[PDB]
Scaffold this active site. Structure first.
Site, PDB file in Angstrom:
ATOM      1  N   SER B  34       0.785  -1.227   0.000  1.00  2.94           N
ATOM      2  CA  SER B  34       0.000   0.000   0.000  1.00  2.94           C
ATOM      3  C   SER B  34       0.837   1.309   0.000  1.00  2.94           C
ATOM      4  O   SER B  34       0.604   2.174  -0.843  1.00  2.94           O
ATOM      5  CB  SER B  34      -1.007  -0.007   1.146  1.00  2.94           C
ATOM      6  OG  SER B  34      -1.584   1.283   1.324  1.00  2.94           O
ATOM      7  N   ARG B 107       4.471 -13.516   4.330  1.00  6.27           N
ATOM      8  CA  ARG B 107       5.199 -12.330   4.813  1.00  6.27           C
ATOM      9  C   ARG B 107       5.701 -12.407   6.264  1.00  6.27           C
ATOM     10  O   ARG B 107       6.395 -11.480   6.734  1.00  6.27           O
ATOM     11  CB  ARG B 107       4.367 -11.049   4.636  1.00  6.27           C
ATOM     12  CG  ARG B 107       3.150 -10.993   5.565  1.00  6.27           C
ATOM     13  CD  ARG B 107       2.096  -9.892   5.264  1.00  6.27           C
ATOM     14  NE  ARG B 107       2.672  -8.567   5.110  1.00  6.27           N
ATOM     15  CZ  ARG B 107       2.038  -7.529   4.607  1.00  6.27           C
ATOM     16  NH1 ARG B 107       0.777  -7.624   4.186  1.00  6.27           N
ATOM     17  NH2 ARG B 107       2.677  -6.372   4.499  1.00  6.27           N
ATOM     18  N   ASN B 163      -6.620   1.136   6.812  1.00  7.00           N
ATOM     19  CA  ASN B 163      -6.220  -0.061   6.053  1.00  7.00           C
ATOM     20  C   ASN B 163      -6.069  -1.338   6.868  1.00  7.00           C
ATOM     21  O   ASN B 163      -4.976  -1.918   6.952  1.00  7.00           O
ATOM     22  CB  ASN B 163      -4.943   0.220   5.256  1.00  7.00           C
ATOM     23  CG  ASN B 163      -5.002  -0.348   3.853  1.00  7.00           C
ATOM     24  OD1 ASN B 163      -5.868  -1.175   3.550  1.00  7.00           O
ATOM     25  ND2 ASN B 163      -4.072   0.067   2.993  1.00  7.00           N
ATOM     26  N   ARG B 165      -6.510  -5.183   7.900  1.00  4.99           N
ATOM     27  CA  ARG B 165      -6.513  -6.516   7.311  1.00  4.99           C
ATOM     28  C   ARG B 165      -6.666  -7.505   8.436  1.00  4.99           C
ATOM     29  O   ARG B 165      -5.800  -7.586   9.314  1.00  4.99           O
ATOM     30  CB  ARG B 165      -5.220  -6.761   6.582  1.00  4.99           C
ATOM     31  CG  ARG B 165      -4.964  -5.809   5.430  1.00  4.99           C
ATOM     32  CD  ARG B 165      -5.991  -5.831   4.305  1.00  4.99           C
ATOM     33  NE  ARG B 165      -6.024  -4.527   3.650  1.00  4.99           N
ATOM     34  CZ  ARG B 165      -5.406  -4.217   2.516  1.00  4.99           C
ATOM     35  NH1 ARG B 165      -4.698  -5.114   1.852  1.00  4.99           N
ATOM     36  NH2 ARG B 165      -5.463  -2.993   2.049  1.00  4.99           N
ATOM     37  N   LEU B 224     -15.721   4.835  -0.235  1.00  2.66           N
ATOM     38  CA  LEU B 224     -17.031   4.203  -0.227  1.00  2.66           C
ATOM     39  C   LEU B 224     -17.191   2.983  -1.141  1.00  2.66           C
ATOM     40  O   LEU B 224     -18.297   2.455  -1.277  1.00  2.66           O
ATOM     41  CB  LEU B 224     -18.113   5.258  -0.485  1.00  2.66           C
ATOM     42  CG  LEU B 224     -18.496   6.131   0.734  1.00  2.66           C
ATOM     43  CD1 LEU B 224     -19.778   6.918   0.419  1.00  2.66           C
ATOM     44  CD2 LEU B 224     -18.647   5.347   2.060  1.00  2.66           C
ATOM     45  N   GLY B 225     -16.095   2.518  -1.741  1.00  2.00           N
ATOM     46  CA  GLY B 225     -16.115   1.359  -2.627  1.00  2.00           C
ATOM     47  C   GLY B 225     -16.397   1.744  -4.067  1.00  2.00           C
ATOM     48  O   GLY B 225     -15.960   2.804  -4.499  1.00  2.00           O
ATOM     49  N   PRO B 226     -17.113   0.918  -4.828  1.00  2.00           N
ATOM     50  CA  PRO B 226     -17.614   1.372  -6.132  1.00  2.00           C
ATOM     51  C   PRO B 226     -18.580   2.585  -6.009  1.00  2.00           C
ATOM     52  O   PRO B 226     -18.777   3.290  -7.004  1.00  2.00           O
ATOM     53  CB  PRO B 226     -18.348   0.136  -6.682  1.00  2.00           C
ATOM     54  CG  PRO B 226     -18.683  -0.678  -5.509  1.00  2.00           C
ATOM     55  CD  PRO B 226     -17.506  -0.480  -4.548  1.00  2.00           C
ATOM     56  N   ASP B 255      -5.415   2.549  -2.670  1.00  2.00           N
ATOM     57  CA  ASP B 255      -4.182   3.335  -2.601  1.00  2.00           C
ATOM     58  C   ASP B 255      -4.036   4.374  -3.686  1.00  2.00           C
ATOM     59  O   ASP B 255      -3.517   5.452  -3.450  1.00  2.00           O
ATOM     60  CB  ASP B 255      -2.999   2.401  -2.632  1.00  2.00           C
ATOM     61  CG  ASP B 255      -3.012   1.453  -1.471  1.00  2.00           C
ATOM     62  OD1 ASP B 255      -3.395   1.929  -0.363  1.00  2.00           O
ATOM     63  OD2 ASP B 255      -2.682   0.235  -1.568  1.00  2.00           O
ATOM     64  N   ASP B 291      -1.020  -3.076  -9.151  1.00  2.00           N
ATOM     65  CA  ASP B 291      -1.398  -1.945  -8.316  1.00  2.00           C
ATOM     66  C   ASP B 291      -0.936  -0.608  -8.799  1.00  2.00           C
ATOM     67  O   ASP B 291      -1.559   0.404  -8.458  1.00  2.00           O
ATOM     68  CB  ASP B 291      -0.807  -2.092  -6.939  1.00  2.00           C
ATOM     69  CG  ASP B 291      -1.234  -3.338  -6.268  1.00  2.00           C
ATOM     70  OD1 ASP B 291      -1.362  -4.370  -6.975  1.00  2.00           O
ATOM     71  OD2 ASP B 291      -1.445  -3.374  -5.039  1.00  2.00           O
TER      72      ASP B 291
END
Lengths: 309, 309, 309, 309, 309, 309
Positions: B34, B107, B163, B165, B224-226, B255, B291
């Protein structure tokens, strides 16, 4: 019927992935160039076609000849200039605009651009029902432009795709040349779009532009991209709408519209039906890389139409 | 303006096809993480940026360095670590949920996780106008988390992308750790979304979360996403809506949004335009595997907006 | 050591299969061009380097800056011409001759060839330990040939790869111009081969061409292709034999040689150990497509030698 | 719960690009065939399955065996016929009808068509809870048809998928033979659709066709392709609708639905939840090339469902 | 000169990767079939050719016609059969024998197998310098065999490649029919290899086999695999060796020798230049997947020859 | 017979092109791991086999199970672990050394490394004629080491591939542990090579090392890479040479020889023959990416042997 087209054939390097070219690693080769496309669309509906064009003494040129020949296009009237390479372009797809495609040329001083009058046979052209060219062919060179003038004075019936490419000449240039072209040389067909009308006459609106074009052409086809097209003819207007379909690559779709429409016209179809069928050639083109490998066939279009209710 | 980010650069192995990974045969490599996406997004608007990050003494470490150098990123403050490997993750695309993407991480105990306070250098850190990190960095290791504390207690202006996860830490822990961070440092920018807000506050309503957040952050970005985004600055609220676009892989889009937003703010666009412009970036990003390869230049963004009227 | 080379970065579309391009469908993109390949070969042995070159203001132009910045090469004195495009070429591979490769140029009147004296700032140049260029640079244009003339007259120390491309000019044009260059300007380093030697001198024995050239150059490398190379210095002669290794793309490989060699000289290396090494760089080149992606690190070259006993 | 099916397994050659096969250069290989597909969808919900099919003594046959055996299917009652090849077919996708795929069969005389009653062991069939087949099996050959007869006289419970394929037999034949098979042999399950219902029953209405079919079958599933499906059982009727999703390859979606549905019925799902669940197996299928690799697990379906509230 | 061949054209599906077909996921499509290969290799030397064949009225069928028309082959005498599909095959490569390839057939009752006397017409065949066919044509079916017989009894001079395929017929089936056909009809050319000779005559050694065959033909071409070939124009005996060269796919190789050889004969070439030339064509072939994409023109054979010093 | 192997299965990501991994874009998924390779090689000859191994509850683990089930491997005695991810590794090919391949691991703390004694079961392990494993299993952790030791106390006949991997443990470490392992447990088979003998014994000479090894193993196999291998049994030494063959990926080849040689022994083969066949297994392997997909059958090996005369 017999259609003859003249213009520069191109080898296309289609970006295998979308996005900016600097990040694309693979390019897929296809034979293209508007007039070549018109040809194949035309033959695929059951008619006959030739092309007057120059390519290089290069693999790319010999690639163009074999490909067209297989497709069934008469190529015996093509030329091979040994002093000039074939002109090529690269397509950048979906960046920076989704659904759209951008061409990056390597054709200045191409063998295609060395198409001159001396390459246009008087007896041969006189045999075609329809002699066809485009704004690209006017734009590429003055030899090529004259070429289009010679084949137009010989003609009997003419069709033109305004097909303005601002990467090839200024709005200004394109305007006078197209205007000039239409002084002499009345047209049987005239294929254009909202944008070219914005250039040629500064007139964005379809039926307006069509009324301004119609002293110089019997039939006008307004390409309208996603939304479809409009046919103007017999003082009448028919709009034929678009289909929603995955878009791999828009390049070639204009030609698929035109070539198919011209050919079905010469097969007897009523104008509404011809445009309608051609809209499906256009829709099919949009969904692969390659200007010519998706061009359907009167049977294929029919299939498409039956299973869409 | 200079941006400095701290976090983990990852190598991405992106499923060359949708579907459960046990039946995907082919993987395409991209550089990501990111903070690194932020960097490039940022420079693509003509500001400067650097990253503080550790990669391994391995081919993937050098991939990361070469890529970001290429992009114009300041990599001279990065660490190379012989004792550990560079972090990598696979992307399973669109399965078992269409549109969504999923990360599968390798990772633990990476070179990137051994990012520490001894790596963040105070003279480098002062000399950014903006210092930015994220929750992934607070999550990957306690040294990395300590690194963000150090970089922030020097920074003068800070930016944190929540962010969250749940693969790296529990919803619970993340609430506790993000609230603590926000407790000890006031932010110029908070970038988050409706999901992280429900995890931190019990509030999923953007407006209601923005109120609770605004004690700690001056500008707030509610991805807000799409549906798009909403920025909240100085009492005002501005929703800027999304676009319908084919979706290849969303990994990255968040990002692209954040990084363009931050950069256009330093360039001098008012918030409304900065958000507008950032949405196109995230919008474009979604359309390809990778990305950064799709991140638009400011010009590229404008071309998008003009051709959409 | 700093090297500054003066040339045309080209963009390479490598044919994915062997065979005549007319039947090859996939092309794979690479950053290349002689001087470009010398820079990165030079850097990999731990020395520094920069390039004076002009690119197009297009996707390929940025491709070349991104790539080269990526490899640690100084790109801050590259120029961008908004008026002409980046120069490209295709490689045809092993057809009609096994092991061999053909370059097909779309580079007439490219941005790359508008390289002009005015692009060679002397403040940058006299910062170099070594100023390199080639016959490619002479052949492409007058303005570019002049840029070598300039650079070379500021230059204290000078390197030249004859690198005669018969597609670019005629054997006699080569002969006159390389001689004319070698009249003014004496050379610390001359890089060439048997075949370039016949074209230039009329002498295709390695020693006799060497002896004739040893008037104009301190150090001379004869590229032998498959059989290796020979080095001539201070009335000594050294031949290092090549390796039997499978061939994918031979292009890039003489560059791999001279660039590696140049750099190793500046590291403190025996002339013979510097050739031995540059040989391995050369042989590694040949196994992949792309001129640069295989260029060896010094440590890397050492692993190869260790493993061959 | 043990499912035994009986059919021909086919090797699939799926076009890598939409468009007429004559301009498609790559085909992707997969194992499929309706019952094979049913088998996997059945096991993916945690029941056991076996398949009675006959393959060639060739690479394709062993491909079938290996793939299914990796999937968990009992392959211990398959047959390897050395005098006929494993039957295959080609998928043309999206041409000339978008969103649709067409099968091009190379299967006449195949090992798979040489299925016969001698190939179905009574002790095997006796320990199955459900014996399932289709009108494909029924249409390929006399021997294969006869096997379905032997099986169904052993079976205590039967399932049947009309699956009419016009390239395999005429509509009249399909109608006769499926009718013949439904009188005698009461069905616990009938999987069918609106198109098959028209062919078999005269009726294309789902309710009136279901009514016509309940003399034969206890539970009836009407596939509505993209609109969802209806299940009819003991007076009840229930319609479960579908999902807007990208379409790569629609072939195999139907089996995914029937097989997921049968399996969850034995996991004791209520009929409404079972179909709901199976529609999601169906929808996921559509999104890839391959009939089987997308086949969702019960867990995966629940993920899809929860992440769609 | 005019060549007319007759037999089955096939669509070839080449394994994109080496190894057993069961573990190969991708397949490359090519147009092939012996007599089709001969055709192209022939026209390549500047001669004319035609093919008498029947393809399916399907995509694979027009793929054939389009390809061959592109290559310059006269296809006007080809027939389209709607009751049967075009024949196809798959090539497994380098498994389990390295450098070899294995053809797996799906051609039984193919449209090509339905070549029949009625398709070959007197006038077309009577106007031809050479009529050519092969043991594959004798072997696909009687109507096909019958086709050769009709064509041979009309032909001025006849040429025949024994080309025994064992997957097609038994050894003794081959022996009887080749001898039967050679007992009627003197051939001008007999092309065969050591293997086929042990089946037909008993005799493994080419020198004895050619003596044995001089009882039937004027010129005999003995393909010797990679050892090269021997040509017996009687009295004399010309051997030409092969070339060590990386082997992608050996199939099509012998056809390339055959077709090139017969052509250069018809152009005035002394026997030994012809075989040498034909060897390079056969050796250029081996190195790509595809039987016809690497077939060299005469100049191209010449380039190959100048550059191997 | 039955073979039981004890080790770590790994998913392998094979570089689609040679060169430094930092410039390779694509990886091809393959199921691999030494012991798993041995199993498949073994089953290929007509013997049974199972593997005791532990994988993650993930796509990759499930990948491992499905693949080995398909091949016919008894995987009933594998375990799945919720706490850890399936081990994976990358292959880098022909760089920096031609012909050679490097492995890049992501396996620390993998499910595979958590293989422990309780996972090896007594009744299971003594239902085999041979119990096999390697240095890799000894190096990956205490618990897997431990598990080898327990398999070996249970077993009467045991097999060890020394399989030293220096990225896994130091040289002095392998010597110590391999030697303390041979210090108990006399072995039926010792599979090593020349390198592994410099490390363990200080001895690079195959003869001298087998003599040092002879008080620990009935039968010794000395692998010579492309030279071949030597088997030492009953005071006899048989040398079996290798073959020239295109090399794509050496990894997998040692196991092909080992597994194949073991299987044939139990299959009754006279020893020399058993090692002759093993060579071809190991020589086919080398020419493909993928340790298992090329594994030959007995019949396949004999085809190789017949068709090399």
């Amino acid at each position: 019927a017999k259609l003859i087209t003249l213009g520069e054939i191109l080898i296309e390097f289609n970006a295998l992935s979308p996005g900016p070219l600097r990040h694309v690693s693979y390019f897929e080769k296809h034979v293209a160039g508007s007039e070549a496309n018109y040809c194949v669309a035309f033959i695929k509906q059951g008619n006959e076609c030739g092309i007057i064009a120059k390519v290089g003494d290069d693999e790319f040129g010999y690639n163009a000849i074999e490909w067209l020949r297989g497709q069934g296009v008469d190529v015996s009237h093509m030329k091979i200039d040994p002093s000039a390479p074939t002109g090529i372009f690269f397509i950048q797809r979906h960046y920076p605009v989704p659904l759209k495609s951008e061409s990056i040329y390597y054709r200045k001083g191409s063998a295609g651009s060395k198409l001159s009058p001396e390459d246009v046979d008087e007896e041969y052209v006189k045999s075609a029902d329809l002699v066809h060219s485009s704004g690209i062919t006017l734009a590429i060179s003055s030899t090529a432009k004259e070429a289009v003038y010679k084949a137009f004075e010989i003609a009997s019936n003419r069709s033109f795709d305004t097909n303005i490419r601002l990467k090839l000449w200024s709005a200004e240039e394109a305007k006078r040349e197209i205007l000039k072209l239409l002084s002499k040389f009345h047209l049987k067909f005239l294929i254009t779009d909202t944008d070219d009308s914005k250039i040629i006459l500064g007139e964005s609106d379809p039926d307006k532009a069509a009324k301004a074009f119609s002293d110089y052409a019997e039939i006008i086809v307004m390409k309208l991209g996603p939304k479809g097209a409009i046919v103007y003819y017999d003082g009448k207007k028919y709009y034929s709408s678009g289909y929603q379909v995955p878009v791999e690559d828009v390049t070639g779709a204009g030609d698929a519209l035109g070539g198919t429409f011209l050919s079905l016209y010469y097969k007897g179809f009523e104008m509404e039906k011809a445009l309608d069928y051609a809209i499906v050639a256009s829709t099919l083109n949009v969904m692969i890389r390659g200007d010519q490998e998706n061009l359907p066939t009167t049977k294929d279009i029919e299939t498409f139409l039956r299973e869409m209710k």
